[PDB]
């Protein structure tokens with residue numbers, strides 16, 4: 001155990017900013033070796049401006065999450081990074097700057113438009129239909145659904161927008177087991193979950209033992225964390241190899257999910273995930289007034 005999905009890098013720093021852990025794909029994306037970085041200082045590995053951004057963000061020890069940091073190394077180029085504090089470690093997760101031609105970009109206009117359209121929705125039903133259609137425009141996903149939770153944590157697909165070629169899931173009910181209590185808990189903490197490719201080979205993080213708590217590294221807060229085989233099989237059975245879900249939060253309660261599926265592996269960068277997050281906040285607020 002102790003692995004992530006390969007579409008990014010995970011570096012784990014101790015509270016003092018010393019590199020204590022890393023995903024095995026660091027030489028393949030940066031050039032530097034994993035062992036040639038464990039025990040190394042962040043001041044040596046990152047450029048002066050990057051180390052400054054990191055130090056400034058980590059100067060408040062209460063702050064659990066950080067806005068995207070441009071991460072540049074001394075041997076560089078720039079990665080888009082997210083940090084989280086969990087299990088007494090600072091997790092720095094990097095998305096490579098290498099954009100694919102199939103992947104969407106330029107989310108601003110489409111997001112402003114989505115929010116303009118969403119505000120004009122008259123009912124809870126028509127706001128969820130507009131949110132599904134608008135998220136599909138922003139992202140390019142094949143199918144986008146609004147999956148609402150019932151009191152027993154079972155859900156129903158109350159809304160959906162999709163490519164004509166893909167099948168419908170509108171009106172379908174599923175047990176609470178499909179999205180279990182511990183998956184649901186992490187969605188109240190980190191609002192967007194991504195699985196760009198259900199057939200990924202997990203990339204391990206070495207060492208997989210936390211050098212402070214004694215206990216192995218808890219990656220339950222990492223964006224790149226591995227997926228339970230049960231969910232991967234569930235997705236494979238419906239023919240969707242790329243997924244993304246955005247929680248609809250009513251306070252800390254999970255009202256539902258904005259579920260996105262793609263037939264082939266599909267990736268939405270940090271910019272588009274933050275754009276979708278905003279749409280979900282607008283939608284949750286409107287659900288609150290309309291309820």
Ligand SMILES: *[C@H](C)[C@H]1/C(=C/c2[nH]c(/C=C3N=C(/C=C4\NC(=O)C(CC)=C4C)C(C)=C\3CCC(=O)O)c(CCC(=O)O)c2C)NC(=O)[C@@H]1C
Nearest residue numbers: 169174177178179183226227228230231234243244245259
């Ligand atoms: C395993 C035996 C049981 C199980 C576990 C499981 N599910 C998830 C995560 C998700 N499950 C879904 C559920 C749906 N997706 C949909 O498209 C539909 C309607 C067609 C449903 C009911 C969702 C949206 C997620 C979130 C992840 C994602 O965006 O795809 C987990 C957590 C996996 C993770 O790492 O996030 C687990 C452990 N699923 C089953 O079916 C079994 C009963």
